[PDB]
Amino acid sequence: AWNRKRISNCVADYSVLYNSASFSTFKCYGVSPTKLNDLCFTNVYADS
Amino acid sequence: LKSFTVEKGIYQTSNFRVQPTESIVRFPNITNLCPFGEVFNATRFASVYAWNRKRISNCVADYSVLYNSASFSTFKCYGVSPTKLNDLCFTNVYADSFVIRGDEVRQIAPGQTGKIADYNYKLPDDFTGCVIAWNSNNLDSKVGGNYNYLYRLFRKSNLKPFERDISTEIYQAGSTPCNGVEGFNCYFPLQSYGFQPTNGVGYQPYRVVVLSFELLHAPATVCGPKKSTNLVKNKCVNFNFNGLTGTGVLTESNKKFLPFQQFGRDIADTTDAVRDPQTLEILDITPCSFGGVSVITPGTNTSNQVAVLYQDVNCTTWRVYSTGS
Amino acid sequence: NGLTGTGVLTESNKKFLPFQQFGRDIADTTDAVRDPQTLEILDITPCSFGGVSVITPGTNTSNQVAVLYQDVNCTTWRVYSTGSNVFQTRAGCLIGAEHVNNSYECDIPIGAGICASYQTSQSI
Amino acid sequence: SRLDKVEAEVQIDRLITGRLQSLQTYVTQQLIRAAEIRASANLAATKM
Amino acid sequence: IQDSLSSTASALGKLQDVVNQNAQALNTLVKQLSSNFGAISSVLNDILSRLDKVEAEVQIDRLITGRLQSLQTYVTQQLIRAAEIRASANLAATKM
Amino acid sequence: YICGDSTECSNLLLQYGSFCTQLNRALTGIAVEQDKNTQEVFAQVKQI
Amino acid sequence: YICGDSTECSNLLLQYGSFCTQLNRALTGIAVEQDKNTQEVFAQVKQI
Amino acid sequence: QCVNLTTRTQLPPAYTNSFTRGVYYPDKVFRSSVLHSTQDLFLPFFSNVTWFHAIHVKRFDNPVLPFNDGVYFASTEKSNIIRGWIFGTTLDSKTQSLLIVNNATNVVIKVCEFQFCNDPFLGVYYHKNNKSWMESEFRVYSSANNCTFEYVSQPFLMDLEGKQGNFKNLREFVFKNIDGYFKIYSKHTPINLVRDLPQGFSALEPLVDLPIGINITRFQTLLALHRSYLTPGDSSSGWTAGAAAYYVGYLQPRTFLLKYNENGTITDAVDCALDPLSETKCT
Amino acid sequence: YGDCLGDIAARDLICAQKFNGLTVLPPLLTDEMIAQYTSALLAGTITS
Ligand SMILES: C=CC1=C(C)/C(=C/c2[nH]c(Cc3[nH]c(/C=C4\NC(=O)C(C)=C4C=C)c(C)c3CCC(=O)O)c(CCC(=O)O)c2C)NC1=O
Ligand SMILES: *[C@@H]1O[C@H](CO)[C@@H](O[C@@H]2O[C@H](CO)[C@@H](O)[C@H](O)[C@H]2NC(C)=O)[C@H](O)[C@H]1NC(C)=O
Ligand SMILES: CCCCC/C=C\C/C=C/CCCCCCCC(=O)O
Ligand SMILES: *[C@@H]1O[C@H](CO)[C@@H](O)[C@H](O)[C@H]1NC(C)=O
Ligand SMILES: *[C@@H]1O[C@H](CO)[C@@H](O)[C@H](O)[C@H]1NC(C)=O
Ligand SMILES: *[C@@H]1O[C@H](CO)[C@@H](O)[C@H](O)[C@H]1NC(C)=O
Ligand SMILES: *[C@@H]1O[C@H](CO)[C@@H](O)[C@H](O)[C@H]1NC(C)=O
Ligand SMILES: *[C@@H]1O[C@H](CO)[C@@H](O)[C@H](O)[C@H]1NC(C)=O
Ligand SMILES: *[C@@H]1O[C@H](CO)[C@@H](O)[C@H](O)[C@H]1NC(C)=O
Ligand SMILES: *[C@@H]1O[C@H](CO)[C@@H](O)[C@H](O)[C@H]1NC(C)=O
Ligand SMILES: *[C@@H]1O[C@H](CO)[C@@H](O)[C@H](O)[C@H]1NC(C)=O
Ligand SMILES: *[C@@H]1O[C@H](CO)[C@@H](O)[C@H](O)[C@H]1NC(C)=O
């Protein structure tokens, strides 16, 4: 029973995730990692 | 014709294609083995914010002595196949060495994001060469912490490929000026890694060495462990000149290359002339397949005798399948 | 909103539905867009348009050339250099050749009954 | 705007090949039509 | 007519045009051997000497497709030119 | 026509200039042939 | 023309023999047609 | 150590034309009798380049100039006056800087954290008792730390004696910084003109590729003045300038059509998309 | 360019054709010249 959360009204920076929380796996499909600061997303869902 | 029966007439076959006789290898004669112990077996490595760059030259790149020890957890090569590393000569090899955290090893790759790939070390999009990384928890880590390795956390903009930034100036996050003091919204950019022997797999020091080189475009000094062979001429042979492999006939040349040129190319963008690495002389390479062939035959229900017409050749042996009469 | 391009933005007359953001052409390319800041529609038009032809004699004779810009009046405009000797034909604006009133067997076909030649100082 | 110039070149190469194929097909059709129109014009000139 | 043919040398352009067209078509076919066609090089030797035969087949396939396209275009051009030259020859035979 | 108003694709396409030039040459020949056809058909007489 | 003086590419190309044969057949037809054209134009009379 | 010069008289800047100049070899591949089309950073034909000169009449020009994707730098001299370059971002001991200096004994190239002062220069002194010109003043920087790169050439002696008459030596350089590599192309030519760049063609051969890894946006030129007993000034008024000139231009991405002759040397080039005739030549 | 930009709210064929680099050249001989040629032919064939 995985958790689903809708996110909206963001400023997607993800530059504050450098102080801690080192990620062992980060794999992205459909978009290049270097273009994440030049895009706007329609409806982001987080499944945890 | 895809049939056992042929009508009377004349047909065109493949040109007079000639097979090679032997194979030769011409590499520059260098006897020294460049240091695999000053790059992989050193006692002190630089930090990631100031990574170490070393030029290597006059090599016999064997890397067969790295099997006795130094097992590599990561070895990923771009621009060249791993199995062809013993058949090539490299122009200018640069080794970039540093130490990072294990979870960050995935960031040493073209087109990646993260603090290492943004503020510390960046690889170009068009990368030739490759990356080696191995765990060194028993060397770079000690009990009570080891704060001898530092990395950058705050920067105004991302780095350019192969750029180093060692300046230590106070970073302003908010709007008030800092003026060289650490306070509120005024951070210090560099901070030290924390390495302990009891940390997890992710939080362990990994030593990373990135080798950069160029292939088959300029005179090469670093070469593989292949042996050399005598030079033959005026015969269709297989040649291997500084990693460039081909088939053809080598002939004495009249062109004079500039001191920084190694290969010559034709209008069709193909190799024509080459300088011998052993003795400095120019040789032209010519294909050994030339001349059309036609077959004159009656119907196969009448006789099996045929005649062969070889174009663009006198007969007054020659380049024929069988002289006969 | 992440869509990058080059063009000219112009006021629009289309009215989008409340759930639409982009408009597309028959060639499946972006034509109209709604401004995220203030809700209004703008049309996007490419800023490259109009053919160019060059009339020249042999390079062993002279280096002077004439330039004919299609689909444009000259009666500044969208030209490389106005210069002088501007002439208007029904094939385009001709720059670099003077206009005369005679009529000979024409040398270089320009179009629409207009031709050009290299004559006499020396000019086109 | 979605991919960097290390994986975006494949799609651009495919698009270039397709557009070139379309242009070549159009040119061949125009050549054949020009040949037949030229034959008709020759007939008209002979008739005149 | 003898003197006019001897003096000028620009009245027989209808045959020089054909000769030049054929020669230029062959030269262009030779020219088109330097295209990468999306591969990493325009030479088979570099690809064979740099990559093994598990990732080198892609570039060779691309090069093969490009060369085949060039050959087909050349053949189509030759067919059209042959048709028009045949029409001209038929006219010449009727005139004779 | 292929990728007008774009810079990266022009750099990629620079390896098809021979094809583009050949297409343009064919079209120019077609246009010249049509003009010659009209001139040959309608200009049999010289004095108006 | 495609990959002359190479062995691996010949093995790869073996799947285009139909295309190569068709091209060669077209060229042979062209040559035979040209010879027939010359013979038909210039050999109207038989006795020298 | 370094001092400030308070004798120059300022004039509005001067501009000249680049006559089909600034073509270099794009690759290290030998080609002969070939028309080759290339796509790279070149100096546009007939460009509006900037002119600086050092004369006594006095004019002594060495300002800070920008660095936009590469620099074409030409120098006409007869007494070896123009003898250094400084590249950097701020030149204020907060960022690394690159220094190239010929001090008549060695060619020093250093990537290093320098503290450059306002007026960097070198100084030669003339002795009346015996005929011997010697370099004596070196006032470029004041301190250097965190000093990464190192290169010192073999010792030599350079003819730095004062010579007048007509300009003799023209030296052309092209600098470009890409992907952490500082690439320098150089060429030398003997000429006999007096004022401006001669009209002609000359191909620049590759000289050096330094793996420096620096953010470079500004650069400055290091000249050499003369100290003589004629002017009794102490340090700021006792300097007399020589006679030299240098021209500066900026590179842009362009298409060029180069011609390789039978011997394999570039003899002519077409700057493509310059004027429509050039485009026709390209096609 | 000021006319094709005018009708951006209404679809057009020629504007879309020209924006993609497809142009149509004008014929060398105008209709008035062809009418003059035809009139000359009529006069010649009637009077003489
Ligand atoms: C600035 C340091 C410097 C640079 C960037 C450069 C190129 C350069 N110039 C020279 C000859 C040679 N080279 C130079 C000097 C110059 N050409 C210049 O751009 C400058 C600034 C000088 C020094 C003033 C002179 C005065 C001569 C005496 C004959 C001649 O005009 O070539 C060489 C080959 C010396 C040998 O192999 O023995 C080189 C690599 N040379 C340098 O010394
Ligand atoms: C290289 O140096 C230039 C100049 O210092 C940097 O450009 C500056 O970036 C900061 C970012 O806040 C701006 O405030 C300045 O206005 C910029 N100055 C200029 C002239 O552009 C540039 O960021 C540096 N490049 C890299 C990759 O770090
Ligand atoms: C939880 C809110 C996030 C919603 C934003 C959704 C899409 C935009 C993307 C952010 C990219 C992934 C976030 C973490 C990036 C890891 C960077 C690193 O340290 O290597
Ligand atoms: C080794 O290299 C040198 C080139 O400097 C060459 O002269 C010499 O002949 C070579 N030795 C052999 C056995 O070829
Ligand atoms: C590396 O160093 C250790 C001891 O210093 C030594 O035992 C080992 O053989 C060395 N390995 C290589 C490849 O030199
Ligand atoms: C912010 O968004 C609103 C839209 O609701 C807009 O009206 C306002 O003008 C925007 N502020 C600025 C400075 O544009
Ligand atoms: C220029 O616009 C005017 C209308 O103002 C028109 O008379 C003319 O036709 C246009 N030019 C041409 C060549 O048609
Ligand atoms: C030269 O001028 C600058 C600023 O004008 C100053 O910082 C410096 O101290 C001066 N040096 C001398 C010797 O006057
Ligand atoms: C061109 O040179 C002249 C010098 O006469 C100068 O006035 C002008 O500013 C220069 N043009 C540009 C665009 O720099
Ligand atoms: C003579 O020349 C030398 C160097 O050439 C110089 O050092 C010296 O000053 C001169 N002699 C005297 C007495 O000054
Ligand atoms: C640079 O030098 C300073 C002091 O001299 C020192 O604090 C710092 O560690 C050095 N940084 C590097 C990358 O060497
Ligand atoms: C090529 O070099 C030779 C010197 O051996 C010279 O004689 C010849 O003139 C040169 N060819 C050309 C076209 O300059």
Residues in D 6-25 with any Cβ partner in B closer than 8 A: 6-7
* Closest ligand 11 atom to B166 CA: 13
Q: Is the CB of H267 under 6 A from ligand 12?
A: no
CB nearest A23 (choices: B103, B153, B203): B103
Chains G, C in contact, 3 or more Cβ pairs below 8 Å: no
In angstroms, what separates the C-alpha of D24 from chain B's closest C-alpha? 23
Longest distance between any two alpha carbons in chain C, whole Å: 68
CA of H112 to the centre of ligand 11 (A): 12
- The whole-angstrom separation of Cα C120 and Cα E25 is 39
Closest residue CA from atom 24 of ligand 2: H215
| CA trace torsion C99, C105, C108, C114 (10° rounding) | 50
Amino acid at H113: E
Task: Enter the tokens of residue B58.
Answer: 């006059």
Q: Which residues fall within 8 angstroms of residue B86, CB to CB, at 6 or more apart?
A: B224, B225, B226
CB contact at 8 A, H51 and H15: yes
Q: Look up tokens 């325009």; give the residue.
A: E42
Does residue H258 fall inside a structural domain?
yes
CB contact at 8 A, H218 and H36: no
The closest alpha carbon to G40, from H145, E94, H33, B188, belongs to E94
CA of H215 to the centre of ligand 8 (A): 26
CB contact at 8 A, B200 and B127: no
Q: Is the CB of C37 under 6 A from ligand 6?
A: yes
Closest residue CA from atom 7 of ligand 5: B69
Yes or no, beta carbons of A32 and D1 under 8 Å apart: no
Q: Within a 13 Å sphere around the CA of I32, how many CA atoms are in the beta-carbon half?
A: 2
| CATH number of the domain enclosing H224 | 2.60.120.960
Q: Which residues fall within 8 angstroms of residue B56, CB to CB, at 6 or more apart?
A: B34, B35, B39, B93, B94, B95, B222
CB nearest F41 (choices: D16, D31, D48): D48
In angstroms, what separates the C-alpha of D44 from chain E's closest C-alpha? 15
Query: What determination technique applies here?
Result: cryo-EM
Q: Look up tokens 């060039």; give the residue.
A: E70
CB nearest B153 (choices: A18, A22, A23): A18
Gapped junctions in chain C, after residues (C–N > 2.5 Å): 75, 120
**Chain C hits for D1, Cβ within 8 Å:** 2-4
Longest distance between any two alpha carbons in chain F, whole Å: 57
In angstroms, what separates the C-alpha of F45 from chain E's closest C-alpha? 22
> Which residue of B63, B65, B69 sits with most ligand 5 atoms within 8 Å of its CB, as the best mutation to test the pocket?
B69
CB contact at 8 A, B97 and B46: yes
- The whole-angstrom separation of Cα H128 and Cα B21 is 77
User: Which domain covers residue H113, as residue numbers?
Assistant: 14-283
- The whole-angstrom separation of Cα B118 and Cα B103 is 15
- The whole-angstrom separation of Cα H9 and Cα F28 is 62
CA of H2 to the centre of ligand 8 (A): 9
Task: Enter the tokens of residue B167.
Answer: 């300046």
> Which residue of H2, H118, H139 sits with most ligand 8 atoms within 8 Å of its CB, as the best mutation to test the pocket?
H118
Q: Within a 13 Å sphere around the CA of H88, how many CA atoms are in the beta-carbon half?
A: 23
Does residue H4 fall inside a structural domain?
no
The closest alpha carbon to E28, from H250, F24, B110, H162, belongs to F24
Tell whether E43 lies on the interface with B, counting CB pairs under 8 A.
Answer: yes
Does residue H9 fall inside a structural domain?
no
Terminal Cα-to-Cα distance of chain I (whole angstroms): 52
Q: In 10 A of CB B179, how many CB atoms?
A: 9
Yes or no, beta carbons of A22 and B203 under 8 Å apart: yes
Does residue H6 fall inside a structural domain?
no
Residues in F 2-41 with any Cβ partner in D closer than 8 A: 2-3, 8-9, 12-13, 16, 19, 23, 26-27, 30, 33-34, 37-38, 40-41
Residue B300: in which H helix or E strand, if any? none
Q: Is the CB of H261 under 6 A from ligand 12?
A: yes
Query: Which of F5, F20, F42 is the best mutation test for I, with the most CBs of I within 10 A?
Result: F42
The bridge status of strand H224-227 relative to strand H239-240 is: antiparallel
Tell whether B106 lies on the interface with A, counting CB pairs under 8 A.
Answer: yes
CA of C45 to the centre of ligand 6 (A): 26
Tell whether A23 lies on the interface with B, counting CB pairs under 8 A.
Answer: yes
Q: Which residues fall within 8 angstroms of residue H98, CB to CB, at 6 or more apart?
A: H86, H87, H88, H109, H110, H111, H149, H182, H210, H212, H214, H216
DSSP B318: -
**Chain B hits for G14, Cβ within 8 Å:** none
- The whole-angstrom separation of Cα B151 and Cα B49 is 5
- The whole-angstrom separation of Cα B10 and Cα B295 is 5
Q: Look up tokens 């038929």; give the residue.
A: E90
Yes or no, beta carbons of H276 and C65 under 8 Å apart: yes
- The whole-angstrom separation of Cα B9 and Cα B300 is 11
Q: Which residues fall within 8 angstroms of residue E29, CB to CB, at 6 or more apart?
A: E70, E71, E74, G1
Residues in E 51-90 with any Cβ partner in G closer than 8 A: 53, 57, 60-61, 63-64, 67-68, 71-72, 75, 78-79, 82, 85-86, 89-90
Q: Is the CB of A45 under 6 A from ligand 3?
A: no
- The whole-angstrom separation of Cα B262 and Cα B216 is 9
In angstroms, what is the resolution? Answer: 3.2
Amino acid at E53: K
The closest alpha carbon to H76, from H160, H8, H165, H172, belongs to H172
**Chain A hits for D4, Cβ within 8 Å:** 32, 34-35
Count Cβ–Cβ pairs < 8 Å, chain C vs chain F.
Answer: 9
Instruction: Tell how far CA E67 is from the center of its chain.
Output: 12
- The whole-angstrom separation of Cα H264 and Cα B277 is 21
CB nearest F15 (choices: E31, E35, E73): E35
Ligand nearest to the CA of H260: 12
CB contact at 8 A, B43 and B66: no
Yes or no, beta carbons of D2 and A35 under 8 Å apart: yes
Instruction: Tell how far CA H201 is from the center of its chain.
Output: 18
**Partners of B76 in the β-ladder:** B131
**Chain F hits for C7, Cβ within 8 Å:** 5
- The whole-angstrom separation of Cα B33 and Cα A11 is 55
CB nearest I28 (choices: C13, C70, C109): C109
> Which residue of B105, B112, B113 sits with most ligand 3 atoms within 8 Å of its CB, as the best mutation to test the pocket?
B113
Q: What secondary structure does DSSP assign to B54-100, as a single string?
A: EEE-S-B----GGGSS---SEEEEESS-GGGTTS-EES-EEEEEEEE
3-state secondary structure chain H: CCCCCCCCCCCCCEEEEECCCCEECCCCCECCCEEEEEEEEECCCCEEEEEEEEECCCECCCCCEECCCCEEEEEEECCCCCCEEEEECCCCCCCCEEEEEECCCCEEEEEEEEEECCCCCEEEEEECCCCEEEEEEECCEEEEECCCCCCECCCCCCCCCCCCCCCCEEEEEEEEEECCEEEEEEEEEECCCCCCCCCCCCEEEEEEEEECCCCCCEEEEECEEEECCCCCCCCCCCEECCCEEEEEEECEEEEEEEEECCCCCEEEEEECCCCHHHHHHHC
Residue in chain B lying closest to A22 (CA): B103
Ligand nearest to the CA of A20: 3
- The whole-angstrom separation of Cα B181 and Cα B171 is 10
Does residue H42 fall inside a structural domain?
yes
Q: Which residues fall within 8 angstroms of residue B294, CB to CB, at 6 or more apart?
A: B10, B11, B12, B13, B308, B309, B311
Interface of F to H at Cβ within 8 Å reads 11, 14, 17, 21, 24
In angstroms, what separates the C-alpha of I32 from chain C's closest C-alpha? 10
Tell whether E24 lies on the interface with F, counting CB pairs under 8 A.
Answer: no
Q: How many domains does chain H have?
A: 1
- The whole-angstrom separation of Cα B209 and Cα B119 is 18
- The whole-angstrom separation of Cα C53 and Cα C70 is 8
Q: Which residues fall within 8 angstroms of residue H67, CB to CB, at 6 or more apart?
A: H87, H177, H216, H217, H218, H219
Dihedral pair phi/psi, residue G39, rounded to 5°: -60, -40
CB contact at 8 A, C2 and A39: yes
Q: Which residues fall within 8 angstroms of residue C55, CB to CB, at 6 or more apart?
A: C65, C66, C67, C68, C94, C96, C97, C108, C110, C116, C124
**Chain I hits for F31, Cβ within 8 Å:** 25
CB contact at 8 A, B111 and B57: no
* Burial (0-12, 13-18, 19+ Cβ within 10 Å), G20: middle
Chains I, H in contact, 3 or more Cβ pairs below 8 Å: no
CA of H15 to the centre of ligand 9 (A): 6
The closest alpha carbon to B74, from B137, B135, B120, B125, belongs to B135
- The whole-angstrom separation of Cα B283 and Cα C70 is 54
Does residue H260 fall inside a structural domain?
yes
List, in sequence order, the alpha helices (H) in chain B: 115, 137-140
Q: What secondary structure does DSSP assign to E22-91, as a single string?
A: HHHHHHHHHHGGG--TTSS-S-HHHHHHHS-TTTSHHHHHHHHHHHHHHHHHHHHHHHHHHHHHHHHHHH
* Burial (0-12, 13-18, 19+ Cβ within 10 Å), C32: buried
Task: Enter the tokens of residue H139.
Answer: 């006032």
* Closest ligand 9 atom to H16 CA: 2
3-state secondary structure G1-43: CCCCCCCHHHHHHHHHHHHHHHHHHHHHHHHHHHHHHHHHHHC
**Partners of H141 in the β-ladder:** H116
Does residue H253 fall inside a structural domain?
yes
Does residue H180 fall inside a structural domain?
yes
Q: Within a 13 Å sphere around the CA of B52, how many CA atoms are in the beta-carbon half?
A: 16
- The whole-angstrom separation of Cα E49 and Cα B87 is 8
DSSP B183: B
Q: Which residues fall within 8 angstroms of residue H57, CB to CB, at 6 or more apart?
A: H9
**Partners of H47 in the β-ladder:** H18
Closest residue CA from atom 12 of ligand 5: B37
